[PDB]
């Protein structure tokens, strides 16, 4: 079929609206989490702009298009993405009128540009260079956390969030690459969350009391087993022919104690003293007697370790992954400043913590392991992006859309065009800005009206960035509030909202292709 | 939505209606299911078998709704049932009841957070004032009464009259063997239900009670090295050839004898590994039996996994099919491993006594399964309510003499704390009346009639509803002392728990 | 079981010597060529059975028209014994196996 | 079996319904069509060639419409969107009238006479270019890559193509074709930057060479293209039974090996260090070149070897006895297999072939190259259009409204029936400036009349409306330009199907 001209955009405008309504609170602590059945058929809860999109199976092309484009920004920030859907279709709701008044969507796409630039100009003029204080990091962390979860949940989790990034900036890494390791853990309540400067393995191998409490940890990560097999035929060697099986029966049990006593050597090679617990870590299993022959010597051998840990352990401890054991010095097997196998429930989760150059900080969350515990697994990594963004930009402003007004004010107050053609677009342009802070207030409390004419006159009074109190519905200084817009965060929505609106605002013929 | 996209079934009206309404659906019976309950519920479980109870969780897990609203909150009700044996009958009703104030406040037009947060701080205020209403504490597990006194409350919160012989029979199962200090175990004390005798013939044999026929002789030793096996007899006779027995006339000769010597070696290897009791979820065979009679290793003819499971659980046994010489890994645990006739049913009996690790095994002699399993249900959720793991349970009025105190506490205070939250704080003190109603439900009078008088009992902690007419006309039964209190904790969770999901399930418009 | 390959043997048995005949078939057409080009130059005996006999030319000729009856007869008959045995062999395969397994 | 007016209208209905948003797609200001799929795949594109394939074709004329768009897409690839524009117009505007006024032919005849009038008018308004000045070209090429709207990398692709196209410029039919594109050979290289990408004499062969192909660096020494007649003879001068068995190996290889010797010893005289065997390549052949003390190269595409016939610039010879530098591998030759990124690349330099440099393209990635690569493929089409036609003509309404008045005056001077086709054709022109005004966001009939006033006086010499700025403009001053050729061609093509669909009165089976 064909939805011609005005009809094609009438589809575009609509598909934006109802979803924007969902996200008027998906955003802020006021933001209401949303759940998904038909997205899978699973019981699924999520709060965030882009992920909920992908989670749902979204038949409508607009939403289908959006999940991809908001991604690129949701890649960066994670919050303001739950914001981003509003301004876009709202701008459609702006301009469609003008083309319903009659006009070219051309000149309005045109018109948005210089407004986008003055915004981009204003984005510079607004963005407040701020410091790297963990405090300054906390409020940027928690505002995204506050957006995505409860402020309490934001608060209690914020610390570990703004902590690891300090050690990942200890690497002088401008972003967060490692220390991104999150661990959900068996618990009655998601209340428990811990910050492990080192890593956590989940296993003690199968053998307790190996000297599993380890202060001096020289980390052997060995992807090869001490358990090849205890029976006749080798681990990968299978035989249904009789004479070939009698061949492997003798040395299969041996090549274990080959690798076993290599460690028993390697223990004394590393240590010479059972005093320092030497940590063997296996990506695969390890024989009980292997553990036994190791454990009694004080060797703590771990089996069935995870490849990311193997990666992490190699990196965090200055560790090593090994396909052989033999004998090596303590440092040839990277060092963890502390290692403790920690049993919660049945599983003993090895705390390998403050590894030498603890390049990977495991953030451990002990919870019901529901999607509720998954529901808090996002805001953190989301907030991680935010502080990473805050790490990225020293320039960060008040949140709660204090910029919106100060944008919408100046950008509109002056004609950046001193034209109709661009100002027409500019008019629509900076108007769709204010959607967020007013509706937040309007969702919180006081209507769009008062808060705006508050915050506008306030900004008009101020030039300070004054922004909504999301628990009141009238503005405050969001610099003082703590809800803080990273220039890295806030900038990209200006890119997206414009650049997406550009081509989608210009369509007339639409048809099934193929 | 309007657009072909947007997967969801929840939202907006259907949230402020159907979700809460679907939440309303299931709490309906939980009202009849908590406190003294004269009500009863037929259930077929996909056996088509009827069963009767007052408990929701047994039923609700079965029930399947489109909407996670029902699907979620049960987890909290489980989260209760996980931590606390009963009150789960209540844990659902309050939330569902407290919820529907919101949709009213939504018709009254109160915001999500606005409606939510009032309950929140009031819930904290509750969690603040809730321990202030601790009216007692438990004392001694060794004491049967000190235990049984409470235990009725949960059995009550399942079924009313039976609780008396039961609660005593429970601490007589020795809840006391465990300290209830950082430890307690069902599987050690596990209910074992003997169909037959009387239902009040339900007994206590400390140490395992296995209704399974106790074969061979009594165990070779009472310490018995216990090798439990899933199917150590798959048969040592093979099923092959023509008749699904034999084909050639020469076939039968080797079929019959082969079972013997294999089982002979098998049951010899039971003695060769040293297992002093043989447990076959696999079949019993008289030769193997006679071998188990020769080698004198007590035999178990058939096993539910529960047998194998507990044997795997308790003994440290491992049930494995052995067409294989048995090898003790299972080894022994229980210091006295017996044959017994309990209910005069052959009862496989293992016993070992330890402050922690002792099996003190509830043996229910009973006339009716359909009862004795629900009789099991209350004692289950009663001893699981005994599970607090505070020997002093910081008791509060049981059967809910609390709500009238708190329904007074909050909404009064609820106005003192100001702002539209106050109404959510004042709505917070309302759904307390649920069980006062839910009992007056099965008692048959008005909660208003109840609460008006039970507000007129004012600061009490004692007088409240129940069964009979003293929950009806006065609505006054002493739910501090009928002998009935409840732990602060199981109470403390329900508020805390039913705070969460209720708050939660509202937030979600998708 | 025994009934499987009892039939496939005499299947394979009369299969090959039959195919031996196919070589001899060309020869039995070539022996119609060789003897017909023998006018009695070289002494023609039939080789027919173990007695090697002083023979005449028509005895040589009429024999190989009768020797083609080897390739004629032995080849044809087996295509019976092929399926004559094959089917009873195929028949007995699933019957006795399913038994001893069942 | 469908026919006649209904088809004649359906032809329009088929053809015309396409161009609607497709004309808005014209110009950098463009309205992408959304193409959803029955699958649900969404497509935003201003380019018909993509749009044409993806859409359900409702009519065989649309099937025919595809043809001439593919034609121009094959013809040049520039203005493919524009070829279906005025084809419908001619039909759309007049057709129903003049067949109701009864004739296919009077319009059909008035297709040509309107056609050359533009061509005649073009060559006046199309004004020559400096190909001597690469920038006199480049500015158009820059105007062309800003038509492709990449001025970032492709402004270099401009030069690289231009520099190449000026070098791949040559050909002789005796009429001496200006460019030759089938000479032009790009490369696709990861590693290096496209700014470091260049063009060198002859055809660079990366096509068969991503790895060792002809040694590495063969400095002077020759590469030998083989169109022989090299097939190792099973006998001496005769072919005999193939080799199934030891005797056949012995006897025949006796006769085989000496023939490749008889052959590739005639190769060793031309001074190869490398011999690339396209024909006669067989187990013995290349085996003897290492015995002929020359590198042998196996089972290669003659496309290269023809490119290579433009690289060292030689011919290729089937002569078994006569194999030489002039026969194959002319010039001193430079055979250089360089690893640019991770891939070893034969560069055949020292071209003996007129001009003739071909394109090194090395991007830091394949992808960073590709953005240059496509517009460089576009610029060469542009450059050659400047080369084929060295008259730059002002883009848009300047070239548009100009011809119209001629056509009208033509029609008016003819004052027959065919006046109406020209009146249709002259008005058929005005769509694109209107479309550009449609595209820009201004009021066209004003700007149209305004542009008429631009012709009423100026004759719209350099004056169209400029769809970007949406104003009456000096396309000379703007530097808005284009070759007459693609202007002519795309237009001359737009005439053709209108001739077709008007000719065709019967759609049957």
UniProtKB/Swiss-Prot annotation, chain A:
It catalyses: ATP + H2O = ADP + phosphate + H(+). Component of the chaperonin-containing T-complex (TRiC), a hexadecamer composed of two identical back-to-back stacked rings enclosing a protein folding chamber. Each ring is made up of eight different subunits: TCP1/CCT1, CCT2, CCT3, CCT4, CCT5, CCT6A/CCT6, CCT7, CCT8. Interacts with PACRG. This is T-complex protein 1 subunit zeta. The keyword Oxidoreductase does not apply. GO terms for cellular component: chaperonin-containing T-complex; cytoplasm; cytosol; extracellular exosome; microtubule. The modification N6-acetyllysine is found at residues 188, 276, 354, 366, 377. Transmembrane segments: none annotated. Coiled coil: none annotated. It comes from Homo sapiens (Human). There is a cross-link at residue 240 (Glycyl lysine isopeptide (Lys-Gly) (interchain with G-Cter in SUMO2)). It comes from the Eukaryota.
UniProtKB/Swiss-Prot annotation, chain B:
InterPro entries: Chap_CCT_theta (IPR012721), Chaperone_TCP-1 (IPR017998), Chaperonin_TCP-1_CS (IPR002194), Cpn60/GroEL/TCP-1 (IPR002423), GroEL-like_apical_dom_sf (IPR027409), GROEL-like_equatorial_sf (IPR027413), TCP-1-like_intermed_sf (IPR027410). Transmembrane segments: none annotated. The modification N6-acetyllysine is found at residues 305, 387, 453. It is found in: Cytoplasm; Cytoplasm, Cytoskeleton, Microtubule organizing center, Centrosome; Cytoplasm, Cytoskeleton, Cilium basal body. The keyword Nucleotide-binding applies. Keywords: Acetylation, ATP-binding, Cell projection, Chaperone, Cilium, Cytoplasm, Cytoskeleton, Hydrolase, Isopeptide bond, Nucleotide-binding, Phosphoprotein, Ubl conjugation. CDD domains: TCP1_theta. GO terms for molecular function: ATP binding; ATP hydrolysis activity; ATP-dependent protein folding chaperone; cadherin binding; protein folding chaperone; unfolded protein binding. GO terms for biological process: binding of sperm to zona pellucida; chaperone mediated protein folding independent of cofactor; chaperone-mediated protein folding; positive regulation of protein localization to Cajal body; positive regulation of telomerase RNA localization to Cajal body; positive regulation of telomere maintenance via telomerase; protein folding; protein stabilization. ATP binds at residues 87-89, 157-158, 399, 486, 491. Its EC number is 3.6.1.-. This is T-complex protein 1 subunit theta.
Swiss-Prot record, chain C:
There is a cross-link at residue 54 (Glycyl lysine isopeptide (Lys-Gly) (interchain with G-Cter in SUMO2)). One of its GO terms (molecular function) is unfolded protein binding. GO terms for biological process: chaperone-mediated protein complex assembly; chaperone-mediated protein folding; negative regulation of amyloid fibril formation; protein folding; protein stabilization. GO terms for cellular component: cytoplasm; prefoldin complex; protein folding chaperone complex; RPAP3/R2TP/prefoldin-like complex. Keywords: Acetylation, Chaperone, Isopeptide bond, Ubl conjugation. The modification N6-acetyllysine is found at residues 9, 54. It comes from the Eukaryota. There is a cross-link at residue 54 (Glycyl lysine isopeptide (Lys-Gly) (interchain with G-Cter in SUMO1)). Coiled coil: none annotated. Heterohexamer of two PFD-alpha type and four PFD-beta type subunits. Component of the PAQosome complex which is responsible for the biogenesis of several protein complexes and which consists of R2TP complex members RUVBL1, RUVBL2, RPAP3 and PIH1D1, URI complex members PFDN2, PFDN6, PDRG1, UXT and URI1 as well as ASDURF, POLR2E and DNAAF10/WDR92. Belongs to the prefoldin subunit beta family. Binds specifically to cytosolic chaperonin (c-CPN) and transfers target proteins to it. Binds to nascent polypeptide chain and promotes folding in an environment in which there are many competing pathways for nonnative proteins. This is Prefoldin subunit 6.
Curated annotation (Swiss-Prot), chain D:
ADP binds at residues 27, 79-82, 147-148, 396, 467-468, 482, 487. GO terms for cellular component: cell body; chaperonin-containing T-complex; cytoskeleton; cytosol; extracellular exosome; microtubule; zona pellucida receptor complex. It catalyses: ATP + H2O = ADP + phosphate + H(+). Keywords: Acetylation, ATP-binding, Chaperone, Cytoplasm, Disease variant, Disulfide bond, Hydrolase, Intellectual disability, Isopeptide bond, Nucleotide-binding, Phosphoprotein, Ubl conjugation. ATP binds at residues 27, 79-81, 396, 467, 482. It is found in: Cytoplasm. There is a cross-link at residues 233-234, 366 (Glycyl lysine isopeptide (Lys-Gly) (interchain with G-Cter in SUMO2)). Its EC number is 3.6.1.-. This is T-complex protein 1 subunit gamma. It comes from Homo sapiens (Human).
